């Protein structure tokens, strides 16, 4: 048969880095 | 036949942006 | 049928904490 549909979207990235002083 | 199932779930997004300063 | 495709990546992850003092 046909392929489905497209999977869901995947969740958030990482947290960003800490900032600069 | 019928569709295939879903794709599977998507993966995670880019890091997150700096914190403030 | 086959698995669709993969999900797309998520959004951008969170701020980093702030930066030290």
């Not at 046909?2 to 600069?20: N, S």
Request: aromatic share 0%.
């Amino acid at each position: 048969g046909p392929p489905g549909p497209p999977g869901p979207p995947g969740g958030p990235g990482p947290p960003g880095p800490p900032g600069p002083p």
